[PDB]
Structure 1
Amino acid sequence: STGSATTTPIDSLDDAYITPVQIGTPAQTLNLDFDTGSSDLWVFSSETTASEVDGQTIYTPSKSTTAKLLSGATWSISYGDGSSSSGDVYTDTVSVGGLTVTGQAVESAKKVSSSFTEDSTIDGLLGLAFSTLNTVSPTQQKTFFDNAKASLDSPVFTADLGYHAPGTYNFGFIDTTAYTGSITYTAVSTKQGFWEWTSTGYAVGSGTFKSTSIDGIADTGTTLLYLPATVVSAYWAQVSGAKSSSSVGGYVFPCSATLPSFTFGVGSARIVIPGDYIDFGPISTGSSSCFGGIQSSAGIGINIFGDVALKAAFVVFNGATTPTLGFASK
């Protein structure tokens, strides 16, 4: 079987993408953030403390005939940006774009951090990293992808994120009409539980391609592109008036500047990120300083190929016994 669901940016800057997901019987539809950088499916629920809920749609397990409390199970997760959430665990039926999994662990948030509360468009997260990162104790739980794997025609899902436009998450098949040319596959390391791979180099604008190995993760749940300091300095040096700002927390540039493209390597292939994708608009309303979409990973400890990079490509997450990542121009 297969599934296909439209994903939509939550705002005008593509800060995140939400995808409708059906949970329970009868269906309760929540808009979840599909995150290949984590492995927990957690949702706002009727159990979330009332003051930490501001406009989100909430999962009510008491209204679902298929919901079962997973007795004794708890979860606690903390994301690389400082966000956190925790609660108890139910099992229920979960459907994405026609693809249905029964008995999926649905982690009910009893407490959520302030950043989730103030984001009324995101009802929860659907983790798509490897199940070894799942935070349910004492019995670790499988992701939606892992539970669906056997029934999928092919053990793959694809991310086709749009630039200021809706996109598509497909499960079980590769849409050969969604990309141009060939798909270039590259090996994945699952040692840290991420979709971790090695880029073969980069280029700035129309400059020479620098062959160098960049280890990083493919993370749909991260907005920006986080690369080593040497690469990020070489990019922003080509933008008149750009500078790293300690008060803002990254590179900013005059909103009047035009940005060069950024090319990253996938084996022998090249993926070009148009310069417009790197503009994240004024740092504050009315400001003439704009925030850059390529930032340093030095403070993070791992390089992150976030939405800025992934939306420039058709990306195949191949969850075969030997996992691989496929990249294609589109």
Structure 2
Amino acid sequence: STGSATTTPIDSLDDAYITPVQIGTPAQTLNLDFDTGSSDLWVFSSETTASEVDGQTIYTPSKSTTAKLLSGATWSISYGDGSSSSGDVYTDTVSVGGLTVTGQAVESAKKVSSSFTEDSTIDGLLGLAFSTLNTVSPTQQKTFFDNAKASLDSPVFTADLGYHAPGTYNFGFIDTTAYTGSITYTAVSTKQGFWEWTSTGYAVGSGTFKSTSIDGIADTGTTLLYLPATVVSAYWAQVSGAKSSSSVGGYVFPCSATLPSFTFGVGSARIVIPGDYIDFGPISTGSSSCFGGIQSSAGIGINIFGDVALKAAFVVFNGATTPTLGFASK
């Protein structure tokens, strides 16, 4: 079987993408952020502290005939940006774009950080990293992808994120009409639980391609591109008036500048990120300083190929026994 769901940016800057997901019987539809950098399916619920909910749609397990409390199970998670959430755990039926999994762990948020509360468009997260990162204790739970794998035609899902436009998450098949040329596959390391791979180098604008190994993760749940300081410095050196700002928290640039493209390597292939994708607009309303979409990973400790990079490509997450990552131009 297969599934296919449209994913929509939550705002005019593509800060995150939401995808409708059916939970429970009868279906309760929530808009979840599909996150290949985490492995928990957690949702705002009727159990979330009332003051911590501001316009989100909430999952109500008491109205689902298929919901079952997973007795004794708790979850607690903290994301790389400082966000956090925790609660108890139900099992229920979960469908994405026609693909249905029964008995999926649905982690009901009893407490959520302020970052999630103030984002009324995101009802929760659907983790698509490897199940070894799932935070449910004492019995670790499987992701939606892991539970669906056996019934999928192929153990793959693809991310086709749009630039200021809706996109598609497909499960179980590869849409050969959604990309140009060939797909280049590269090996994945699962040792940290991420879709971790090694880029073969980079180029700035029309400059020469620098062959160098960049280890990083493919993360749909991260907005920007986080690369080593040496690469990020070489990119922003080409932008007139760009500088790293300690008060803003990263590289900013005059909103009047035009940004060069950024090219990253996938084996022998090249993926080009247009300069317009790296513009994240004024740092405050009316400011003439704009925020850059390529930032340094030095504070984070791992390089992150977030949405800025992934939306320039058609990306295959091949979850075979030897996992691989496929990239194609589109």
Task: Give your verdict on TM over 0.5.
Answer: yes
SS at match of 2:181: strand
Q: Measure how far apart 1:137 and its partner are.
A: 0.0
Q: Distance in 1 between matches of 2:258 and 2:196?
A: 32
Q: Measure how far apart 1:161 and its partner are.
A: 0.0
Q: Distance in 1 between matches of 2:250 and 2:318?
A: 33
Match of 2:305 in 1: 305
Q: String of CA shifts for 1:167-218, please: whole Å, max 9, x gaps.
A: 0000000000000000000000000000000000000000000000000000
SS at match of 1:308: helix
Match of 1:268 in 2: 268
SS at match of 2:147: helix
SS at match of 1:74: strand
Q: Measure how far apart 1:312 and its partner are.
A: 0.1
Q: Distance in 2 between matches of 1:329 and 1:70?
A: 43
SS at match of 1:277: helix
Q: Distance in 2 between matches of 1:186 and 1:240?
A: 35
What are structure 2's unaligned runs of at least 5 residues? none
Match of 1:207 in 2: 207
Q: Is residue 2:197 matched to residue 1:175?
A: no
Q: Which structure 1 residue ranges, 4+ long, deviate > 2 Å from structure 2?
A: none
SS at match of 2:182: strand
- Structure 1 length normalisation: TM-score? 1.00
Match of 2:73 in 1: 73
Q: Distance in 2 between matches of 1:255 and 1:43?
A: 37
SS at match of 1:15: coil
Q: Measure how far apart 1:237 and its partner are.
A: 0.1
Q: Measure how far apart 1:87 and its partner are.
A: 0.1
Q: Measure how far apart 1:82 and its partner are.
A: 0.0
Q: Measure how far apart 1:62 and its partner are.
A: 0.0
Q: Measure how far apart 1:106 and its partner are.
A: 0.0
Q: Distance in 1 between matches of 2:106 and 2:207?
A: 48
Q: Distance in 1 between matches of 2:255 and 2:47?
A: 44
Q: Distance in 1 between matches of 2:115 and 2:76?
A: 16
> Percent sequence identity over matched residues?
100
Q: How does 1:24-35 map to 2 (within 5 A)?
A: 24-35=24-35
Q: Measure how far apart 1:113 and its partner are.
A: 0.0
SS at match of 1:181: coil
Q: Measure how far apart 1:147 and its partner are.
A: 0.0
Q: Measure how far apart 1:295 and its partner are.
A: 0.0
Q: Measure how far apart 1:317 and its partner are.
A: 0.0
Q: Measure how far apart 1:320 and its partner are.
A: 0.0
Q: String of CA shifts for 1:264-320, please: whole Å, max 9, x gaps.
A: 000000000000000000000000000000000000000000000000000000000
Q: String of CA shifts for 1:200-241, please: whole Å, max 9, x gaps.
A: 000000000000000000000000000000000000000000
- Structure 2 length normalisation: TM-score? 1.00
Q: Measure how far apart 1:98 and its partner are.
A: 0.0
Q: Measure how far apart 1:109 and its partner are.
A: 0.0
Q: Distance in 1 between matches of 2:126 and 2:243?
A: 36
Q: String of CA shifts for 1:238-269, please: whole Å, max 9, x gaps.
A: 00000000000000000000000000000000
SS at match of 1:180: coil
Q: Distance in 2 between matches of 1:249 and 1:41?
A: 30
Q: How does 1:133-212 map to 2 (within 5 A)?
A: 133-212=133-212
Q: Measure how far apart 1:32 and its partner are.
A: 0.0
Q: Measure how far apart 1:86 and its partner are.
A: 0.0
Q: String of CA shifts for 1:132-185, please: whole Å, max 9, x gaps.
A: 000000000000000000000000000000000000000000000000000000
Q: String of CA shifts for 1:19-45, please: whole Å, max 9, x gaps.
A: 000000000000000000000000000
Q: Distance in 1 between matches of 2:51 and 2:304?
A: 33
Q: Distance in 2 between matches of 1:275 and 1:44?
A: 36
Number of aligned residues: 330
Q: Distance in 2 between matches of 1:270 and 1:313?
A: 10
Q: String of CA shifts for 1:40-69, please: whole Å, max 9, x gaps.
A: 000000000000000000000000000000
Q: Distance in 1 between matches of 2:152 and 2:115?
A: 35
Q: Distance in 1 between matches of 2:270 and 2:80?
A: 28
What are structure 1's unaligned runs of at least 5 residues? none
Match of 2:239 in 1: 239
Match of 1:122 in 2: 122
CA RMSD of aligned residues (A): 0.1
SS at match of 1:105: strand
Q: String of CA shifts for 1:78-121, please: whole Å, max 9, x gaps.
A: 00000000000000000000000000000000000000000000
SS at match of 1:116: helix
